[PDB]
Design a protein around this ligand. Structure first.
Ligand SMILES: [Co+2]
Ligand SMILES: [Co+2]
Ligand SMILES: [Co+2]
Ligand SMILES: [Co+2]
Ligand SMILES: [Co+2]
Ligand SMILES: [Co+2]
Lengths: 314, 314, 314
């Protein structure tokens, strides 16, 4: 597959710093080289310089609003750029708040995109339902057309325009949802597969349905937002908001191997990897390594093996 | 849901002490408060004072017979009491031998109850088939109507009267069954799902069947006996009789989430949590925390989220 | 079941030494006694003395060719011997290269055998596709009739004669396959269930199919080649070529419990257990213990329990 790598060292969508190092440790882990080791055409668009916004007091309850909306606005234009270059945008990031810019920059070029959101959280709190004020748990509320009119005018998000509808998104791996978030899920009839559904059906069926759900009517470009906390902390420990009972390494690879096989992946996000939150250097590499394997899977790496269109027996 | 909490600090059903601390660490973990944090009506009936029985020599091979039968007799009347108060009895306990009193006190008020027994063991040894003599591995043999006439007159259990039939109980999670126990399973045609069946069918089907099995004919009150050793020791390490290859955290939550959804849970047991057997203070909290989540699930806590009958968007 | 135990302390099929201790730690773990504890008729044929071959320079890229082909030749005749004694051959070994001798010695007496290969690797590299040269990753290429004419004349393997066809083998647990290996899989139409298929279908279906695949047409003798690295390293850490995302303890027991139930197991291999590669003495026992349980399962040990044809209630 042909990628467009976008480094996004940002963290103002949540409290803990160090998630801005994600693009760094991932690159160092050798991700770009491992991609080229496959049938991949890779172009690094560099790491986005998210300049400081010293004057960014809270907006009611929302924290660092101007800083957040800015990094998303900057990211959206970059993602749009690479999609214009006929390349799958790989946004290696910090916190999940950057999903607003990615999905927005993606939809500008591909207004018919479908979104798959692998996460332990729905991150669909409104600036009015959020109890923490951290924007990495509200990205979705900003992107839904149905919620347009419920979201306040937050400093830094004037450029924003709801690009996705409730029936164009699927959630997978949910196990920590707030009440208001749950009310939004049921009311707008959003399709999701919480860990309960995963245990019930199996990841194979869950994926069968998810794909049938988002591509049944017709084929469309897929945007995969992967929050590393969707996977169990025994696999991705170094992350800010971990939650026990997560998707397994295998389930994570299965999800992505299946996504790849559709040949419709056009947008990818690898979020919440925070090297600093690892209790041991092994938890940091265990996280990063897990984060890389998921990415590679997105672009062709299959557990049953891979081979070029040649005769290996000669 | 509306509960009736019953603390049961008992341990004479097995060798290791410290399981009598279970009600204590569970309460301290904040279980009662977490229940009220939900749509729960909670009434604490206190911790039962299980006075000593200094004169309790063995009965053939059975250990502490008078002490055991006594704590069960005391518990049975308490459970009956709370069920008379229209409340689901939550028996936080020590060893599993206390199941005799719970299920008995439950059936007095609800003679048509169905039993689900999540455990790594069938605990159906008779005082005559038991090779260890520990009563926390024989509770079931005392409660079956079909085995009435095979069980000797053990000091402390004269009050006992078999209240459940072989076709009213389902086992889930079996992986360590004695030969005599197995002979009883097959001979009385008891329905069970050992880890083998779980791996084969999946926990979703296993539950589908279990419920269809116990409620198909008609709806009846359910009594859930949960032995914390049914779950894998990587989740509930601090327990006396651990066994590898147990149910997963997720499978445990799935089982209970499904039980809750029937709206027929009327009796619950949280057994074998022994703080003292933890190799680290983290194994103790990992166990207790796991023990709490399972309880909460029984009363409504759903992984996909929860919300009150209000308009969260206002 | 009735077994013929064959100790195979060999390691020249791979770089790390210490895997030759496998038969030792397994025996010490009490495997032979645990088998007799069941309905098993056990005869220990001792540990094969694999004399050194000081003069064994590489053959092109292949390492220790003369040493390897020799231990396989010796093992083949032993396996043939025990199968002639109407006994299931249990080859406790070192590296997986010994599969060549086992499957060969097995087929001499049972030319219609079916092979199930539980491994993280297909070990089907040819001396010409192998990039490492380690023979414990090529055993299969030596045994396939379809590859006869592609394999060079390697010093030590003149006695060898391809006894199995591509449609008589099933792979389970694959997650690390080389490109040439993958080309051979697809080209010869070999049936396999990589971890992807396991996650998709479940281990219950995977086994359903595997068995239907190898026994559908007619019943035939089964040879189970179990590489301990097929299971996840969290279960079998002390092994040379570990790979994350492996089969679970439960899945491993399920596979074998199912194999046993066919009543067609005639050949078994327990390979790659290397005590020396354990980071802790607990990783060594965790591996060995896991290795034993799998063996016992092969011969009747069922998680739901076991009982003799007697009346336990008397
Ligand atoms: Co999350
Ligand atoms: Co998120
Ligand atoms: Co138990
Ligand atoms: Co029990
Ligand atoms: Co292997
Ligand atoms: Co192997």
């Amino acid at each position: 597959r042909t990628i467009g790598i976008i480094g996004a060292p940002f963290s103002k969508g949540q409290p803990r710093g160090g998630v801005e190092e994600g693009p760094t440790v991932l690159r160092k882990a050798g991700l770009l080289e491992k991609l080229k080791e496959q049938e991949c055409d890779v172009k690094d668009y560099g790491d986005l310089p998210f300049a400081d916004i010293p004057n960014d007091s809270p907006f009611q309850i929302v924290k660092n609003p101007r800083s957040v909306g800015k990094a998303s606005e900057q990211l959206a234009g970059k993602v749009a750029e690479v999609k214009k270059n006929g390349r799958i945008s790989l946004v290696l990031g910090g916190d999940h708040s950057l999903a607003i810019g990615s999905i927005s920059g993606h939809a500008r070029v591909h207004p018919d995109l479908g979104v798959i959101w692998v996460d332990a959280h729905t991150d669909i709190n409104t600036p009015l339902t959020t109890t923490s004020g951290n924007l990495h748990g509200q990205p979705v509320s900003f992107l839904l057309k149905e919620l347009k009119g419920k979201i306040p005018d937050v400093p830094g998000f004037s450029w924003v325009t709801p690009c996705i509808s409730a029936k164009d998104i699927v959630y997978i791996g949910l196990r920590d949802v707030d009440p208001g978030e749950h009310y939004i899920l049921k009311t707008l009839g959003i399709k999701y597969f919480s860990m309960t559904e995963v245990d019930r059906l199996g990841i194979g069926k869950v994926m069968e349905e998810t794909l049938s759900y988002l591509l049944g009517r017709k084929k469309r470009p897929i945007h995969l937002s992967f929050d590393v906390d969707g996977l169990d902390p025994s696999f991705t420990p170094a992350t800010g908001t971990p939650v026990v009972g997560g998707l397994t390494y295998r389930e994570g690879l299965y999800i992505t191997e299946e996504i790849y096989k559709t040949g419709l992946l056009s947008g990818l996000d690898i979020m919440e990897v925070n090297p600093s939150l690892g209790k041991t250097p092994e938890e940091v590499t265990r996280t990063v390594n897990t984060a890389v394997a998921i990415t590679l899977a997105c672009f062709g790496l299959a557990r049953e093996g891979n081979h070029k269109p040649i005769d290996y027996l000669n």
